[PDB]
Amino acid sequence: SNKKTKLIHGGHTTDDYTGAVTTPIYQTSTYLQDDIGDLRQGYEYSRTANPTRSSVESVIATLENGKHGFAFSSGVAAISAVVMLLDKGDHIILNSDVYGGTYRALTKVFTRFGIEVDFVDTTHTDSIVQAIRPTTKMLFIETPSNPLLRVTDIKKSAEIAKEHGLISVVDNTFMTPYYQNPLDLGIDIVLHSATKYLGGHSDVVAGLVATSDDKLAERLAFISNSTGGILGPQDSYLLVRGIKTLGLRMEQINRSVIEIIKMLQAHPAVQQVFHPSIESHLNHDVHMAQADGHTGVIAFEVKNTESAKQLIKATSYYTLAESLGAVESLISVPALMTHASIPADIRAKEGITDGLVRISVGIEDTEDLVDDLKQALDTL
Amino acid sequence: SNKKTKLIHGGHTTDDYTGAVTTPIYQTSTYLQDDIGDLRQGYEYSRTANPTRSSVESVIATLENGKHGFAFSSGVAAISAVVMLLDKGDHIILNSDVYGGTYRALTKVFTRFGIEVDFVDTTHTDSIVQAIRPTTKMLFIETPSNPLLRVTDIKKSAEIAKEHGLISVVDNTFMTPYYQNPLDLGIDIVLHSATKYLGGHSDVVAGLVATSDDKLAERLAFISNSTGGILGPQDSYLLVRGIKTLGLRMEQINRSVIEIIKMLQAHPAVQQVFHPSIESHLNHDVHMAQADGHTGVIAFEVKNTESAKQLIKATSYYTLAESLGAVESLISVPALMTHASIPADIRAKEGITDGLVRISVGIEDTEDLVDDLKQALDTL
Amino acid sequence: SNKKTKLIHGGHTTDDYTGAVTTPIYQTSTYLQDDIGDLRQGYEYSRTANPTRSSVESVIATLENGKHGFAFSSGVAAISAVVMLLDKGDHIILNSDVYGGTYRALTKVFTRFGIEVDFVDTTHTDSIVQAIRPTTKMLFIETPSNPLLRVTDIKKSAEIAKEHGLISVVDNTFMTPYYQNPLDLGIDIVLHSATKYLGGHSDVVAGLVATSDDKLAERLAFISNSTGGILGPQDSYLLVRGIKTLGLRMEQINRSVIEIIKMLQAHPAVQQVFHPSIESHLNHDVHMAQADGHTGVIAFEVKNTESAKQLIKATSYYTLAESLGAVESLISVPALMTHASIPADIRAKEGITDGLVRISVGIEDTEDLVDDLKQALDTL
Amino acid sequence: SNKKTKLIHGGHTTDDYTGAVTTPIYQTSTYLQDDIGDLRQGYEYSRTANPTRSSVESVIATLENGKHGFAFSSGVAAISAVVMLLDKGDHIILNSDVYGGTYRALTKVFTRFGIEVDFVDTTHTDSIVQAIRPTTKMLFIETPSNPLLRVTDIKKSAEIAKEHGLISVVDNTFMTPYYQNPLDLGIDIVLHSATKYLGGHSDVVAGLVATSDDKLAERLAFISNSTGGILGPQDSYLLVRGIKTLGLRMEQINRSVIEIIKMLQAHPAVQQVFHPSIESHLNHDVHMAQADGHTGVIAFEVKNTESAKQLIKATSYYTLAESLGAVESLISVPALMTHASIPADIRAKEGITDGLVRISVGIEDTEDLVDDLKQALDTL
Ligand SMILES: Cc1ncc(COP(=O)(O)O)c(CNOCC(=O)O)c1O
Ligand SMILES: Cc1ncc(COP(=O)(O)O)c(CNOCC(=O)O)c1O
Ligand SMILES: Cc1ncc(COP(=O)(O)O)c(CNOCC(=O)O)c1O
Ligand SMILES: Cc1ncc(COP(=O)(O)O)c(CNOCC(=O)O)c1O
Ligand code: NA
Ligand code: NA
Ligand code: NA
Ligand code: NA
Ligand code: NA
Ligand code: NA
Ligand code: NA
Ligand code: NA
Structure with a gap:
């Protein structure tokens, strides 16, 4: 089963109820419960889950060979949600030529929350090791980068992160799941600005996240539900499409x-x-x-x-x-x-x-x- | 002039170009530039601004008699954006009866970023004065509250906040701008889960924020742009409707x-x-x-x-x-x-x-x- | 029970599968079959039926106290579908004050197909009886009329049509089902430009038709399916809303x-x-x-x-x-x-x-x- | 300028006003006039014209190398609109293996309006000549046909139609404008079920028509406006996409x-x-x-x-x-x-x-x- 087939048949993107060949657009906010806490299909409030968003999430998880997907209102929002996995005092290393908005968010927002940052030229993996402190909890890598397309060794950065107990994040936006699968090389979390190639049609602003780590996924879900930068259903539909x-x-x-x-x-x-x-x-x-x-x-x-x-x-x-x-x-x-x-x-x-x-x-x-x-x- | 008329004609909710009576749905991510930096209507990237989102923002600003509107992917995301006005070490006071998710977000997320929270019975405004610490930077009030409908004196809490240098935030979700206008009583920021009365039809999850403070508006715009919990155009349209x-x-x-x-x-x-x-x-x-x-x-x-x-x-x-x-x-x-x-x-x-x-x-x-x-x- | 309640709870406008409180938008064209001819919910091609369109159809049928609803791309398309109940040589009577476009359609289009039309002042029902020819098959009434608001006796025109074997059609656009229910007075078919009061927000162009006649309903379904002026799912949703x-x-x-x-x-x-x-x-x-x-x-x-x-x-x-x-x-x-x-x-x-x-x-x-x-x- | 480029840049599919790179979705019914009859962008009512539908129409006209496009709620509706170019007594020849729904519409609807039909095996062009009566006004050809893919000589059928004064219609649905351009071979009208390849994603039911004949286009427009099987704006957007x-x-x-x-x-x-x-x-x-x-x-x-x-x-x-x-x-x-x-x-x-x-x-x-x-x- 090759990639062009997986793209068509991977993930849940049809309607079990009616059999529609495309994901229904659930423009809805709440769902009736049969009794208190008894959800008939697991839905209770659309910030928490929405069948259209669950569809797109399933797609991104499948294409990135992960188990859990998450859809945010913007790639920037996906990045924020991942960084909010950390606490004040935690330290993250990113590559020095990181996208303008990722830099802007880490340095004028999340530093105000006591998160320490080091920007490092990751084209040589050992600069990561130089940067690692005992408070370091996360490694975050774009590859290739904007706008000079500097390449970073994903498998090596995963080995470094594993051995030092870091959450490894790769920002796969420029390659898409079609060409590069960071989860397959040991990375913990992979994220995309779906605004680019995934959406593909200059008509959706959205971010996507995928992981195989159950406990990381549980934390991501808690953050998504409590800070709420979720992708709406119409944009999720257009993303699947x-x-x-x-x-x-x-x-x-x-x-x-x-x-x-x-x-x-x-x-x-x-x-x-x-x-x-x-x-x-x-x-x-x-x-x-x-x-x-x-x-x-x-x-x-x-x-x-x-x-x-x-x-x-x-x-x-x-x-x-x-x-x-x-x-x-x-x-x-x-x-x-x-x-x-x-x-x-x-x-x-x-x-x-x-x-x-x-x-x-x-x-x-x-x-x-x-x-x-x-x-x-x-x-x- | 009168409220029922203001609802129909307040804000910009028509198309200047074609004369359409309803706000176009600008399902789009980017905009052509005539020359480098030359935007035809001020739009360059949809995370930063989007004409349909700007339409809903203009409506909520007009209705709350403020100058600046902001549309977020959810009310919780509006609350997050407002709380991100603070830094590690800052202290916020909230009223003792708060929506479950606001409690969850402040106590299980923003505390991890070194933001201190105290829930105070604001039904007696003077309890706020005792609760103010030297690190207190924000006062946050639902009124009436969810679910006990506790009333807090908005004008009094605004006076207190002005006198101690706090950002006053009222969560006007339960009253809607039709009945209560916190900005008119001295509050700095007014917030809504637009998922409720504003949207009105159980079919949109969204947040709205309105202020007259130019510099608070600028910081909010920077936060929204750098964390990206923006409301999509289709939901913005449905909100206007x-x-x-x-x-x-x-x-x-x-x-x-x-x-x-x-x-x-x-x-x-x-x-x-x-x-x-x-x-x-x-x-x-x-x-x-x-x-x-x-x-x-x-x-x-x-x-x-x-x-x-x-x-x-x-x-x-x-x-x-x-x-x-x-x-x-x-x-x-x-x-x-x-x-x-x-x-x-x-x-x-x-x-x-x-x-x-x-x-x-x-x-x-x-x-x-x-x-x-x-x-x-x-x-x- | 009462009208304001019927508006909210009449018809099928929720999702049985997920329990969603609003009609899903089934932006889809075809449906999976489990075996050849085995449709999971009765859907096989969206021109024939579509769950969102069926939702709006159920609403208009419930509101007009009929059994069958039909959603067309425009009120003019509903009128066309109804007029196509007739054959070359058949004669139709309409009231003397009619919407410009209904006049244009009957006199500049359906006459070319050998359908004869006479406009008759139905404010006095007995003028209908004189106007009935042996080739008269349909009576068509706006009341009040566009733009002079001429009133016609619906119950009397229904009695006349029954006694002479005519299909009685009332164009209830100006009154809405909230105030006038022609089917309850003996009329065979009731028609709306849903573009107006029903849609309510100047943002949908659509037609709706309702009847209790099973065989008229079957002929209407055949016409709609064979000429295809069907209302799309997004507009059907906005109509329900x-x-x-x-x-x-x-x-x-x-x-x-x-x-x-x-x-x-x-x-x-x-x-x-x-x-x-x-x-x-x-x-x-x-x-x-x-x-x-x-x-x-x-x-x-x-x-x-x-x-x-x-x-x-x-x-x-x-x-x-x-x-x-x-x-x-x-x-x-x-x-x-x-x-x-x-x-x-x-x-x-x-x-x-x-x-x-x-x-x-x-x-x-x-x-x-x-x-x-x-x-x-x-x-x- | 090759086909894959024309697909991207052919037609008007951006917003002149704001510069959006995608066609705005004008979910709207009417447009304000500066004075009576003075339309600022040529729009007055969405059945007559709608900027999103005008976009898709421009696309289909460009790709089929015609001058005028038309978008209907279904391919069946496009076919009906074309057949309504004829009057009672007129005769049309179609190929004998025509699509089920086209056959059904010509034989159980338009025959009732006095339109004469001959179904002919057009794999040999001279069967068309045998079928031509003096009342023949239209020739209608699928190629290839469903489901046996019988091919008909388009250029020859155009020559036959020209010499006998017929309106030639080709139903290009199976080939798309990407592979076959009937207008370039002398055909008068080309139509598509956009439900298939054009829409491409099993999520839109729509028909499209394209011609270079100004007077044919004017008649098509009159029919479209007076019978109203127009494509809605959301489906037009999805079609462009x-x-x-x-x-x-x-x-x-x-x-x-x-x-x-x-x-x-x-x-x-x-x-x-x-x-x-x-x-x-x-x-x-x-x-x-x-x-x-x-x-x-x-x-x-x-x-x-x-x-x-x-x-x-x-x-x-x-x-x-x-x-x-x-x-x-x-x-x-x-x-x-x-x-x-x-x-x-x-x-x-x-x-x-x-x-x-x-x-x-x-x-x-x-x-x-x-x-x-x-x-x-x-x-x-
Ligand atoms: C890795 C990555 N994440 C995130 C983003 C942006 O995320 P979002 O979808 O929120 O715009 C980008 C691209 N941002 O480009 C905007 C521009 O070209 O001006 C990106 O490369
Ligand atoms: C007062 C208030 N503010 C803010 C919010 C957050 O809004 P949102 O759900 O749009 O993120 C809510 C969310 N309420 O949702 C379920 C319920 O209480 O019945 C709220 O009630
Ligand atoms: C009574 C009536 N029936 C039927 C119709 C046809 O409806 P539609 O425009 O949805 O095709 C109309 C359309 N009216 O439109 C413009 C106006 O008169 O102000 C109508 O007024
Ligand atoms: C030439 C042509 N016109 C028109 C159509 C159909 O037009 P519409 O878009 O209205 O379905 C078709 C295909 N109809 O197939 C439906 C099916 O496979 O069951 C077609 O081939
Ligand atoms: Na699948
Ligand atoms: Na792993
Ligand atoms: Na205005
Ligand atoms: Na003030
Ligand atoms: Na019901
Ligand atoms: Na009856
Ligand atoms: Na162009
Ligand atoms: Na020609």
Whole structure:
């Protein structure tokens, strides 16, 4: 049973009652009880459980080879729920190039709650060991990262976490369960911004979490019910729907990624390309050992900010917008958009050069995408 | 101008573009930018803002005579966002009768983050003054309370909070903006489980928050954006739709409440009755001075839990389920359902006895509701 | 038992499986079969049946005291389905004041299929008897009519239709089942533009049909299934939700209607007033004998079309738009908007003059609605 | 600009106002007018136009290389609207193996309206010429047909229709605009059951129509507005969404179709296979000349009804359900399901043998689909 089949038949996404081939949308808040505490299908209040959300949860658990799924109103909310597994005084290590909003949440919210943070370049696993204190309880890793796609050894970070008694969390958003399964490599918790590839259609903001640990799942459920950043039923339905085409979409995206990178490597206006598919990429071997495909986010550097802006205006099929994982291919300038608050000279130290472009490859025709970007690069 | 008109025309709930009479459902995650940083209507990512969510936010702000609305995935998520205004070491005062889940969240979650909580009988405002510690930063009041309907003097608690530098928060869920407007009495933040009267149809789980404080609004926006417990667009739409009928629904409910209370006060199988409309009810004067109506939540004592169970089975129009503020009239035993997370000995001390019944009066015919409940109580 | 209770508990609008208090939205097209021909709940293809559509159908059947409900994509589609009960050569009688689009559909579409139509002044039932041809198979009545609110004797027209073997159809859109129940007076089929009062929130375009005739129901089901103008599940859900508040909304509307009519009768810039509540209105006795209330549609004459235009601009709470039965109060000029498809000379003969204004009274405050309309008419 | 790009960027499917990357869902019934007849974006009533429906219409028009799109509540409703282009006395020719519901509508509804019908085996174009009377106004062709996939020469049928003054209609449902574009070959009107491949997710019942003829479009619009079988906004949104993945889905489906047919042709329990991809198939050359891909519906004959039933029970990834074009692969027995009313001996004359199986190939893994069906055929 291969992935494209599991996508279609994995999880519970039909109606046992009527036999509907799609998950009913339970736009509802409460459920009648036959007697006090006697729930006929286990439902009592939609913050606690909702049959549509339970459906999407079952899907994410199945695809990530876990036992328990959780759906939150945003990826940010999923991350918050996971971090609220810790107490004041606990210490968490994250990779240093973590997504802007994850950094913002750990440093201007959860530090105010007495949670200690260390940001570490996890491209070398031993930096994690250097960072481990006796109060360390959680290790949190994106791979690949935004926007330079730095790869981290998932299996090694799981071994480190196991031996030091840490909760290991991988943020699988850029790879999707279709290409990378952190739970299979020993990670405790895997989470996604379902806003991207999973939803797939730029029409749902949601986060998903999956684990095989029963006691971790029980704590996650308690947090979800007591802080309430749950995904609504309509968005859960749209998420299930979106996930159906995930394999086909990721494979189209990957075909275009490969051709686009060959174009970028051959082009003169491009000084450097960041993507784990490139054999000179740091930890390319590690990535190929922990995934059987690629993310569709690519970064490449052109000479300056005005060649970036000109590339944006010269493209016909790349769309200037926030986010990634859309059907549309998206384009952006991290120096002017996501990393604008970071000053110029320090963002050169960080790698966010003035001419760094990030594309999120969509499901348009591969030749249209390659050709369009190449003619734009020929205008420079 | 008048309340029933304000419900229809207050806030922005039409489409400027097409002239549509109802708020469009912007089931979307991202927005096109004309130039880098150039947003056509101020939208760039749906976690940050979404036109349908902004519609509901504008409605709740208008109705509570504040300046800023916020829509969360649940009332519990609104409460979480407000509590995250505090830091480790800060102390919060709440009133002694609180919704089960608010108690659970503050005592089993935010204490782990070093936030101190004390539950204080605010029916006498001066008890707040004694309870204020030097680390007290927030005062949080339900009024009337769930499930005993204890009244607290909102204007007095606002004066106290101003004089000691506390953020005053009122949880106006039971009264709705139709009858009670805490911001107009000096409160800093007003909160709702929009799951109840506002949504009105048992089909949306959501929270709403409103303030006139610009800097509190900015901190709330930062929290919502960094933890992501945002209300989705479909639920935001359904909330606006529901809020339209709010006045008509509350006025039916009040008509029915009056007759049901006279019935309960006269009935032999009914012991104590809890509702602020009763002249012997503690702080009844206070309630009539701060509200223009009554909540539809009523609590009353029967002899024991199995007389509760039999009363529940004998009713034909009261539905055994959690939550309140629906069109259906609802019935429950708070000790065994909504307030089970409150410890037993405290629930006995407070009066939330095993035979305490809570009804939420709906919009069915008043005579059907009175007769049905009375014929059922004649069974005991 | 009583109407306000029937609105809440009549029909099947809960989930038997999970106990959900609201009708699930079965956004689905097909259903699993356990064996060939073995349907788990009787569903096999969503054009034929859909559980959410069946929910709304059960509601309208219950409310109209019939046995069979039908949900169409629009009221016009319900009318089409009913007219398709006839064959080429059959003759239908309609009342002389009909909604613009019903006129357009019967005279510009179904005549091309050899269906003969005659518009007859049914305010005197005996005019029907003269109009009956040997090819007459159907009698079709709006009451009150759009936009002149002409009353027709429903019980008398049913007796006539029974005695001559005609299918009697009443278009109960203006009255709603809350106030008038044609099936209870012998009519065969009752029809609604559910777009109006039933939906209630200007957010659903839909039609509903109800009958107790088993064989008419079977022919209607065959027509709906073979021409496919079925109501979708999301709109069916929103219709159920809307119908919940129908009694409360109609009762507000009626309270406002009474005061607005006294204002209009007294105003100097207002000539004739059309509404069945007026004692001098033709067949006012008849209306009070067949209904327990009044529609919120009022028509009245101002001097000319530009006094209409100025009255429209001067109002603050009346909205210039098509349709009726919304929470917003609406205002229009039928001659130039809804009834423009009716030929001009017939519209002048009938009284649908260029200065005929139609308001649909909404649920805003009665005093705001009276004062606003009167201050605007003081402008002429 | 290749097909997979056109799918993503063809048509208007973003919000000009806010810049949302997806079509807003206009759950609304009416739109305010600035003055009488002055519509700010051309909208006045949602039966007439609705921005979400206008979006989907634009998509279908673009993909079929037409100028005008129309969205109906069902494919059946689209077909009815097209047939209502004719008048009593007009004559239409359809292919003899037309879909059950199209046959049912033409013969038990539209014949009652004086429309004459001839059902003709259009696999030889000259049978059309034999059938042409002087009253013939319309030619209506499915290709390939259900369930034996008979191919008809589209370009030739267009030439015949042009020379005899007929409205040519092709029912492109089985091929989708991705593989066959009848308008490009001279056909006047092309229609789809969007319930199948276009929607793609078994969650929308809808029909779509596309033409380049301005006067035909004007008539179609008049019919749509006066009979009202319009697609609702939520289903239009879901249709746009579904159409995004159409190319990827059709290509996966086609890869599996080819492998599955090689398996079926090689298997002993299979006596005969029906699919236009087979070179011995009647008019295979014609199909390859008018399409650049294949439908995913395949028929094959096994010995008897009990080998069909056993094949259904023995498969793990083929699902017994009505309809086609799902993500799930579907399986059925036409003799016992769609063609059950037709007697046994005459269905042998028709080709609907007792052992005829129809599969609708989904987007599961190709090897899982081939293997699963082959092991089932090895159980016979
Ligand atoms: C790992 C991870 N988690 C979370 C997120 C975001 O989570 P959420 O779904 O709440 O937006 C992102 C992406 N955030 O991008 C927004 C942008 O491109 O401006 C992400 O990469
Ligand atoms: C006063 C109050 N505030 C806040 C909340 C939290 O709201 P939410 O459930 O939307 O998260 C609730 C939730 N009540 O729910 C079940 C019940 O008591 O019958 C509440 O009652
Ligand atoms: C009495 C009546 N019946 C039937 C119908 C048809 O209903 P629908 O628009 O849902 O197809 C209508 C539609 N009215 O619409 C605009 C207006 O008159 O203000 C109607 O008024
Ligand atoms: C050409 C065509 N038009 C129309 C249709 C059906 O149109 P609609 O979308 O109204 O179902 C079909 C398929 N109908 O199948 C239903 C089934 O498999 O039982 C079709 O092939
Ligand atoms: Na399954
Ligand atoms: Na493990
Ligand atoms: Na307004
Ligand atoms: Na203030
Ligand atoms: Na019922
Ligand atoms: Na009868
Ligand atoms: Na476009
Ligand atoms: Na042409």
